[PDB]
Design a protein around this ligand. Structure first.
Ligand code: CLA
Ligand code: CLA
Ligand code: CLA
Ligand code: CLA
Ligand code: CLA
Ligand code: CLA
Ligand code: CLA
Ligand code: CLA
Ligand SMILES: CCCCCCCCCCCCCCCC(=O)OC[C@H](COP(=O)(O)OC[C@@H](O)CO)OC(=O)CCCCCCCCCCCCCCC
Ligand SMILES: CC1=C(/C=C/C(C)=C/C=C/C(C)=C/C=C/C=C(C)/C=C/C=C(C)/C=C/C2=C(C)CCCC2(C)C)C(C)(C)CCC1
Ligand code: SF4
Ligand code: SF4
Ligand code: SF4
Lengths: 143, 74, 42, 743, 80, 74, 73, 157
């Protein structure tokens, strides 16, 4: 059992002068992303989009344009610094969707509450020939 | 002069034929991509893994052979 | 000394020695038997 | 902070043990090959020192000794040129009759039929005509006998040995400490004042004591064997005084500031000597003297051990403003840390310099009998353009390697760099737009002219006879240069260059040297082509640098390295996102730009400059002034330039120029050969190789080093290398056959 | 979205998950190998199709497969 | 006569490349290995490396020697 | 172009262009209905082969017909 | 003291504030162009835009056109500018037809730079866009006619 931490607005954002690498209309009408982390101090870190920003001591909130930017920055926060991070997807309705770490456990560490998806129980060479799924909507790897 | 150009023409027929035949016989798979039949006639590639796999599809073999055909008919 | 002979056994160096010998040979053969579209000795 | 000599003793042991361990420098490569890919990596990583080790001191020591190796090779090469000038040249016969004899410094052996390449170059000499220019240098240096060339070749060989020795010495015996390299103020002070200053002064010395007098006897028609030896001018000052009377004073006017009395052999006349067609040697010696003073002064700007002077860090930090923040703060730390940064700036400036040299040497021919030797002049201009362009693309490559490898805002921060990175999208978007605008409004005008000319509407073209696009600004400039002497340069007797000033056509041996170069709609259109091509090259390379770290498509791009093929077929496909692939793409555009530049040079010079002159002064240009009316259309370039001027190289068979015909066709061949690599991909080739490998295993002759297709990156590198070699060598053969036959 | 599948040749070395730049893959428990874990692709709607996972797999042949399929804003890696 | 000869030779070339293209597409989409077991068609796939390797040999021989003779004469 | 330049170069370039359009006054009054992206990998192979072939055929056709008909013999 | 700041204070919205972007002169001038008059009927803004542009297009067509040196028809080369107004008006029309459906509300922003709620421009509606297209056509034809009406006492006729 794991309860995703809710996104807390009014969480401070890093010190940064602005860049052309930030959000666009996509964030207004489609979706954007938010990564939060806890920092032990004020540090300089490389922004996945602009140049250099100053991570604030304590909780940090950072809105990014793509999920991959959140995961890249988080990978670095966990690597260069030793910082726990989470990030979420945010729709223009205000709805928030917690994304990562999905279990509260990082996905490279096996966690027992996890259900198999897209797992085929056979060697890859035992997939059927296309002719055997022709005119059916299926793909030989969907089995 | 006709001897020499006839052997160039033989070269073009053999090379174009080599590209197309290898493309057709390796369309279902190779050692680099044994499951190629599962990816269809035309796909970009199979990524930079396993050494790099650009132009590994059968459609790519056609695309390559058209150059040799234009050369031969030239 | 042993290491130097080893270096001289390496692919590019052995190749330059080998093809340089071959080139001198073929050059001298074309020097004593120039032109020649055929094997004339039958 | 006390600058001093710092080295370490015996850091690396001189041994053949690692000669026998291929890839010793790399921990992975040293394990030897499991596949053929190993063999390529061994050569691609050999000079990538900062990938071998992370210790800045070791890297700096490798760099230093490597530079010694380079200089050794250069001295061996100069030894070759002087030795061939002494032993296998017609340089003395040419020295007698320069306007007729063709310079030749290479002779071929009679083995397989190739002796036909030993052509009639004059002076009873059979050989290959040389376009390097060494004869005009040697004449300008007062060199007369082959013996002097021998002595120079021996000295050059000795210096090759000394440089090589110093490389081994400073890598294996006394290897400087890292602090020694980072003493930037000392280095700049010694290269400004010591290297450039004392070099220019020394050369001024040789010129006033050797070059000027010996060239006076040459110009006066004296036989070179009868000319006094250069040291006889140093001993008996009466020889010089007869030639140059000022030498009777004993350098007393120099100390008494009577320097105007030296206006005899130190002059500001400008223009060209009408006998030799080269710049006045008095002006040149005076020039090297002034340059010597300027650099000797410039070498005292930086503080070292005596408190006076500048620290460069101070200068940087003081320079900041309301738009750039704290800018320049941090650059001293970057430029004393990253070799790739220094190599980037130095490649940029050295290539740009080489291009400037290319212009200044044609518009101001510095050596005697150089301007009228059109093969040498075309060869020099084209050559230095190529060197410059290559060097600049290199500057982009190493700016990118800095960004990927040495950039770290948490350690060595710079405000200017951060701000640039913070509006990279604006910069690249605007450069993109300018490139499109320039494409349309330079090349689209050509297409306009081709279409109007084909439709029978030459009055609707862009032409000096239809819709004129006059380069009014450049015309005004060259007018101002023409009016400069006596007005804004009262000391200057004539124009700065004969391309400016009207009249004063200079002819040598019936051939013209320089006359005023006209400018019109054709020159306008071409110049905007050059603007266009340069802007697109800058776009590709700068875009490569600024997005090497990251982008909206790939946020973690810097973790993939400087040189990587892609990040896969996803995100729509990400091939050629690496900064390396931006250098790859920019090489083609440097080729395009420089190609159009040298075509513009050959075309314009043969049309409006070079040619023969009548006894009564009627000039016939090599081509009939057809630049203005034929270059304003792409069909005119295809027909009146390429199709016309290629006749020599396709007609060279059976002559001594047939080698240029062979290289014409062969360079076409390697260029087309590159298209195999550039248009395909290694997956196909690896599969084919699987079948070939099957065939070898069938006969027990499959190799242990498993055959592999080239890497994606290597496919690209091979491709661009053969593309560039083929194109450049094709234009090489074309140019040399053309200008050697018709020049 | 791109399809991503795991095959029971998987040995549970976790490298596909470690390589993934959009967090598509997880390690779930399993009894078929010694590491007692097998990969899974529960979030392929975020899959961009770069095949870093495939570059990371040590199994011969692969135990992750990315079948590039219907493109979306997320699969094309668009930040706009 | 020139225009027609050129016309039909280029048409013929494109048609040939297409023929091989659809051979490959056949192998991917329609080919049923079990239903063609051990017949001539499956045996094409079974010894594809001999086929491809010998086309490679013929193309290399023709290329080496035709190009070599042209270059010698030049 | 389509045969030597590959996609990622153009995709990043187009991203800078999207930024440019959204941040330009008067022009950002106009919005695209379809997100501008660089051509696909295969699509570029096809487009470049088609340009290569059209240029091939049209070049040789012009030379053939002009060189023969110009002489008619 | 520094001249460049993030856009509207938010440093993670992808843009910057410069003398070019946010300046009283620039902000006033852009705010006083018809396209940026959000409360005005789009038909009138289209009138102004069409008048300005249609008037502008006459110059290059007449002076650079094929009949430019036949002053008898060269002056009448303004028909070409009229035709370009027609084509542009087609482009506008199909842009609106493609972009806006009948009953959809405006897609323009309903906020100001200072955060207060705003009423969105009707230009970004199907009816508002149709009105702006009709206005641009009318004003464009009219501006071409007005420029062609003046052939006299101009250094470049
Ligand atoms: C004279 C004897 C000598 C000996 C036995 C050694 C021994 C060694 N050196 Mg040293 N060194 C020497 C001279 C010598 N060096 C000289 C003269 C220089 C000045 C250039 C250097 C500068 C130097 C550096 C900077 C480094 C070494 C390194 C090394 C070690 C690595 C092994 C190796 O170098 O393989 C190399 C084998 C080769 C054959 C190298 C050939 C390179 C030549 C000079 C290029 C020739 C250019 C060629 C003409 C281009 C035309 C090509 C054309 C035909 C296509 C090794 C123990 C490296 C090290 O420390 O290892 C960790 C290291 O980085 N040396
Ligand atoms: C002038 C252009 C050119 C050239 C010379 C080649 C050459 C070749 N192609 Mg290629 N191709 C080209 C363009 C070209 N291609 C283009 C534009 C495309 C579209 C991308 C393709 C796509 C392509 C495919 C898909 C295939 C080929 C194949 C082949 C090989 C055919 C067999 C052969 O002819 O034996 C050899 C012929 C030669 C001409 C080799 C020339 C070099 C000789 C050996 C020089 C000898 C070295 C000499 C001593 C100098 C040494 C230099 C020194 C620095 C070391 C051959 C090496 C087929 C193949 O691999 O065959 C097995 C194959 O499947 N090509
Ligand atoms: C294949 C069809 C086609 C046709 C029929 C034309 C016809 C014409 N072109 Mg065009 N052109 C075409 C294709 C075509 N072009 C393409 C594909 C390109 C891109 C390369 C061009 C680019 C081009 C340029 C750059 C120019 C022309 C010009 C001309 C005119 C030159 C003759 C002239 O001086 O008349 C008379 C000259 C006039 C100015 C009379 C104007 C004609 C009136 C305005 C017609 C009214 C138009 C109509 C209301 C709206 C049309 C759209 C309609 C479907 C709703 C002529 C009427 C020239 C031109 O138009 O001059 C400005 C010229 O500048 N063409
Ligand atoms: C596959 C292509 C090819 C072939 C078949 C030939 C064949 C020949 N060439 Mg050519 N050539 C080629 C390509 C080719 N060449 C290329 C690519 C180039 C450019 C580099 C040249 C450039 C060239 C030149 C410049 C010349 C030739 C010459 C010759 C003839 C020399 C015969 C000889 O050496 O005496 C006999 C040699 C031997 C018997 C040696 C074999 C004995 C061995 C070493 C020992 C045997 C022990 C038992 C020969 C018939 C020469 C000639 O005179 O033409 C008539 C000559 O002048 N070639
Ligand atoms: C007036 C003193 C002086 C002079 C003349 C030079 C000259 C040169 N330096 Mg050096 N340098 C100096 C002081 C000097 N340096 C100082 C104070 C520092 C900082 C501590 C550096 C550190 C430095 C580095 C890191 C490098 C150079 C390099 C070079 C060469 C650049 C390429 C070139 O121009 O080739 C032109 C060729 C010539 C002018 C031929 C004459 C060269 C003679 C033989 C050397 C004369 C000066 C020499 C230092 C005297 C010491 C010899 C003695 C100790 C035995 C060049 C020969 C590069 C290099 O090492 O290339 C191998 C390079 O990497 N310099
Ligand atoms: C003084 C200038 C200078 C210096 C010192 C360097 C130094 C370096 N460069 Mg740079 N670069 C330069 C200029 C320079 N470069 C220029 C002018 C360009 C434009 C082309 C580049 C573009 C560039 C790129 C794209 C890359 C580098 C890389 C590197 C590093 C690896 C070098 C290596 O091991 O390759 C080994 C050398 C070879 C394998 C030789 C290759 C043979 C060439 C391709 C053929 C030459 C043809 C010949 C002249 C003519 C035909 C003769 C033939 C028939 C025999 C190294 C530190 C690489 C790197 O990874 O950086 C870390 C890299 O990717 N450079
Ligand atoms: C002749 C071949 C060719 C052509 C036409 C182009 C064209 C272009 N390249 Mg490319 N390139 C080429 C070869 C070519 N390239 C090759 C071989 C490579 C591999 C190395 C590259 C790699 C490359 C890179 C990496 C880049 C470019 C860029 C560009 C663009 C530069 C901006 C510009 O000039 O816009 C204007 C367009 C032109 C000058 C083309 C001609 C325009 C005609 C004359 C106008 C006709 C319009 C008419 C109305 C048509 C309508 C008719 C109707 C029926 C539709 C441009 C469109 C740069 C870019 O993206 O742009 C900034 C860029 O970064 N190229
Ligand atoms: C507009 C550009 C321009 C340029 C590039 C030059 C260039 C030159 N002028 Mg000059 N000059 C100009 C404008 C210009 N001038 C004008 C408009 C006038 C008035 C008509 C003069 C009057 C003038 C005189 C009287 C002299 C020169 C001289 C010179 C030459 C030596 C420079 C010098 O005196 O050191 C620098 C002089 C200084 C007072 C220090 C100023 C520091 C500068 C900015 C660096 C030089 C090539 C000298 C000459 O004839 O050389 C042979 C000389 O005696 N000029
Ligand atoms: C050279 C002329 C450029 C004038 C820039 C005007 C200029 O020098 O302003 C200088 C301006 C002042 O900066 P600061 O006062 O902060 O500088 C102080 C420190 O950086 C130096 O100590 O810098 C900028 O405005 C940032 C650059 C933005 C401007 C980008 C525009 C680029 C377009 C240029 C290309 C068009 C002309 C090309 C002709 C060659
Ligand atoms: C009568 C006569 C004669 C004879 C002749 C003969 C006997 C021949 C024939 C010939 C032949 C014999 C030919 C052929 C050709 C062929 C081709 C051209 C082919 C092709 C193929 C393909 C294209 C394939 C396809 C495919 C694949 C790949 C797989 C799948 C299936 C299929 C089939 C689809 C002579 C001349 C002596 C003389 C006169 C008379
Ligand atoms: S470069 Fe090759 S591996 Fe990379 S995305 Fe393109 S086709 Fe695929
Ligand atoms: S293709 Fe890339 S994004 Fe998709 S699952 Fe594999 S690593 Fe993750
Ligand atoms: S890389 Fe392969 S073996 Fe390793 S966890 Fe992923 S699917 Fe399993």
């Amino acid at each position: 059992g794991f309860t995703p931490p809710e996104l807390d607005p009014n969480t401070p954002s890093p010190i940064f002068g602005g860049s052309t690498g930030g959000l666009l209309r996509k964030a207004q009408v489609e979706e954007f992303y938010v990564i939060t982390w806890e920092s032990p101090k004020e540090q300089i870190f490389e922004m996945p989009t602009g140049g250099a920003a100053i991570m604030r001591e304590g909780p940090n909130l950072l809105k990014l344009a793509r999920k991959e930017q959140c995961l890249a920055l988080g990978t670095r926060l966990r690597s260069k610094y030793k910082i726990k991070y989470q990030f979420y997807r945010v729709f223009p309705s205000g709805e928030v969707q917690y994304l990562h770490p999905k279990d509260g456990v990082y996905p490279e560490k096996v966690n027992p509450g996890r259900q198999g998806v897209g797992v085929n129980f056979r060697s890859i060479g035992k997939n059927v020939s296309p002719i055997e799924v022709k005119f059916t909507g299926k793909q030989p790897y969907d089995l | 002069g006709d001897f020499l150009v006839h052997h160039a023409i033989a070269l073009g027929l053999h090379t174009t034929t080599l590209i197309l035949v290898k493309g057709a016989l390796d369309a279902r798979g190779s050692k680099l991509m044994p499951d190629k039949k599962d990816f269809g006639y035309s796909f970009p590639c199979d990524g930079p893994g396993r050494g790099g796999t650009c132009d590994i599809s059968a459609w790519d073999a056609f695309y390559l052979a058209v150059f040799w055909m234009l050369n031969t008919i030239g | 000394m042993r290491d130097l002979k080893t270096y001289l056994s390496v692919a590019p160096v052995a190749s330059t020695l080998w093809f340089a010998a071959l080139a001198g040979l073929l050059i001298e053969i074309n020097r004593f038997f120039p032109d020649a579209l055929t094997f004339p000795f039958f | 902070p006390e600058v001093k000599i710092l080295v370490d003793r015996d850091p690396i042991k001189t041994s053949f043990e690692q000669w026998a361990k291929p890839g010793h420098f790399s921990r992975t490569i040293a394990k030897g090959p499991d596949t053929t890919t190993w063999i390529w990596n061994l050569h691609a990583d050999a000079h990538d020192f900062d990938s071998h080790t992370s210790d800045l001191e070791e890297i700096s020591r490798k760099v230093f000794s490597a530079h010694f190796g380079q200089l050794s090779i250069i001295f061996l090469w100069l030894s070759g040129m002087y030795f061939h000038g002494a032993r296998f040249s017609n340089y003395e016969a040419w020295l007698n009759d320069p306007t007729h004899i063709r310079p030749s410094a290479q002779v071929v052996w009679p083995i397989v039929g190739q002796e036909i390449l030993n052509g009639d170059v004059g002076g009873g000499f059979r050989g290959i005509q040389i376009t390097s220019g060494f004869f005009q240098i040697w004449r300008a240096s007062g060199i007369t006998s082959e013996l002097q060339l021998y002595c120079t070749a021996i000295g050059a060989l000795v210096f090759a040995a000394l440089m090589l020795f110093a490389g081994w010495f400073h890598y294996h015996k006394a290897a400087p400490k890292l602090v020694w390299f980072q003493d930037v103020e000392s280095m700049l002070n010694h290269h400004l004042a010591g290297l450039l200053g004392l070099g220019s002064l020394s050369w001024a010395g040789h010129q006033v004591h050797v070059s000027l007098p010996i060239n006076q006897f040459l110009n006066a028609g004296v036989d070179p064997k009868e000319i006094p030896l250069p040291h006889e001018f140093i001993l008996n000052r009466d020889l010089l005084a007869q030639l140059y009377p000022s030498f009777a004073e004993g350098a007393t006017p120099f100390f008494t500031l009577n320097w105007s009395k030296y206006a005899d052999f130190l002059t500001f006349r400008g223009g060209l000597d009408p006998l030799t067609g080269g710049l006045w040697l008095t002006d040149i010696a005076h020039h090297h003297l002034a340059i010597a003073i300027l650099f000797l002064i410039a070498g005292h700007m930086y503080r070292t051990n005596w408190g006076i002077g500048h620290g460069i860090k101070d200068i940087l930090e003081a320079h900041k403003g309301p738009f750039t923040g704290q800018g320049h703060k941090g650059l001293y730390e970057i430029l004393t840390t990253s070799w790739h940064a220094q190599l980037s700036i130095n490649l940029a400036m050295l290539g740009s310099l080489t291009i400037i040299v290319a212009h200044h040497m044609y518009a101001m021919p510095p050596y005697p009998y150089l301007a009228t030797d059109y093969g040498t002049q075309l060869s020099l201009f084209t050559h230095h353009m190529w060197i410059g362009g290559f060097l600049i693309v290199g500057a982009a490559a190493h700016a990118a390697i800095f960004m990927v490898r040495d950039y770290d805002p948490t350690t060595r921060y710079n405000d200017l760099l951060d701000r640039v990175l913070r509006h990279r999208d604006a910069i690249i978007s605007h450069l993109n737009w300018v490139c499109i605008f320039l494409g349309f409004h330079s090349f689209g005008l050509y297409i306009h002219n081709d279409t109007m000319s084909a439709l029978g509407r030459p009055q609707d073209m862009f032409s000096d006879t239809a819709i004129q696009l006059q380069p009014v600004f450049a015309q005004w400039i060259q007018n101002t240069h023409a009016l400069a002497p006596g007005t804004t340069a009262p000391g200057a007797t004539t124009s700065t260059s004969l391309t400016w000033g009207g009249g004063d056509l200079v002819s040598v041996g019936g051939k013209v040297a320089l006359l005023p170069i006209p400018l019109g709609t054709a020159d306008f259109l071409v110049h905007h082509i050059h603007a266009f091509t340069i802007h697109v090259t800058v776009l590709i390379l700068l875009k490569g640098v600024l997005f090497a770290r990251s982008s909206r498509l790939i946020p973690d791009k810097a973790n993939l390295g400087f040189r990587f093929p892609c990040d896969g077929p996803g995100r729509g496909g990400t091939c050629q996102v690496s900064a390396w692939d931006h250098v790859f793409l920019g090489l083609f555009w440097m080729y395009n730009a420089i190609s159009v530049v040298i075509f513009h040079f050959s075309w314009k010079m043969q049309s409006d400059v070079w040619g023969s002159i009548n006894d009564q002064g009627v000039v016939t240009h090599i081509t009939g002034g057809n630049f203005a009316q034929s270059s304003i259309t792409i069909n005119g370039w295809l027909r009146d330039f390429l199709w016309a001027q290629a006749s020599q190289v396709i007609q060279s068979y059976g002559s001594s120029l047939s080698a240029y015909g062979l290289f014409f066709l062969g360079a076409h061949f390697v260029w087309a050969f590159s298209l195999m690599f550039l248009f395909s991909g290694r997956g196909y080739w690896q599969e084919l190789i699987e079948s070939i490998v099957w065939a070898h295993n069938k006969l027990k002759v499959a190799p242990a080093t498993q055959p592999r297709a080239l890497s994606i990156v290597q496919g690209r590198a091979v491709g661009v290398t053969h593309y560039l070699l083929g194109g450049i060598a094709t234009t090489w053969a074309f140019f040399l056959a053309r200008i050697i036959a018709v020049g | 979205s791109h399809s991503v599948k795991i095959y029971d040749t998987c040995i549970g070395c976790t490298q596909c998950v470690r390589a993934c730049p959009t967090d598509v893959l997880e390690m779930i428990p399993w009894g078929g190998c010694k590491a007692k874990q097998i990969a899974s692709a529960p979030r392929t709607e975020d899959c961009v199709g770069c095949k870093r996972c495939e570059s990371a797999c040590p199994t011969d042949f692969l135990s992750v497969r990315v079948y590039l399929w219907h493109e979306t804003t997320r699969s094309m890696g668009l930040a706009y | 006569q020139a225009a027609l000869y050129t016309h039909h030779q280029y048409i013929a070339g494109f048609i040939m490349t297409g023929a091989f293209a659809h051979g490959a597409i056949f192998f991917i989409r329609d080919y049923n290995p079990e239903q063609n077991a051990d017949n001539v068609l499956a045996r094409m796939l079974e010894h594809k490396e001999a086929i491809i390797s010998h086309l490679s040999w013929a193309s290399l021989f023709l290329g080496f020697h035709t190009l070599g003779l042209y270059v010698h004469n030049d | 172009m389509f045969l030597i330049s590959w996609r990622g170069y153009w995709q990043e370039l187009i991203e800078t262009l999207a930024w440019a359009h959204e941040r330009t006054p008067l022009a950002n009054l106009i919005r695209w209905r379809d997100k501008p992206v660089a051509l696909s990998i295969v699509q570029a192979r096809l487009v470049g082969l088609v340009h290569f072939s059209v240029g091939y055929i049209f070049t040789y056709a012009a030379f053939l017909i002009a060189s023969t008909s110009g002489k008619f013999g | 003291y520094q001249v460049v700041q993030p856009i509207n204070g938010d440093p993670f919205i992808g843009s910057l504030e410069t003398p070019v972007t946010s300046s009283p002169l620039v902000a006033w001038y852009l705010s006083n162009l018809p396209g940026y008059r959000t409360a005005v009927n789009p038909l009138l803004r289209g009138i102004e835009v069409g008048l300005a542009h249609g008037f502008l297009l006459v110059g290059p067509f007449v002076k650079a056109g094929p009949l430019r040196n036949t002053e008898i028809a060269g002056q009448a080369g303004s028909l070409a500018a009229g035709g370009l107004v027609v084509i542009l008006s087609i482009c506008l029309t199909i842009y609106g037809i493609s972009s806006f459906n009948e009953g959809d509300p405006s897609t323009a922003p309903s906020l100001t730079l200072t955060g207060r709620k705003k009423q969105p421009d009707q230009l970004q509606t199907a009816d508002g866009w149709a009105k702006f297209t009709g206005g641009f056509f009318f004003g464009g034809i009219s501006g071409v006619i007005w420029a062609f009406f003046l052939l006299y006492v101009l250094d470049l006729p």
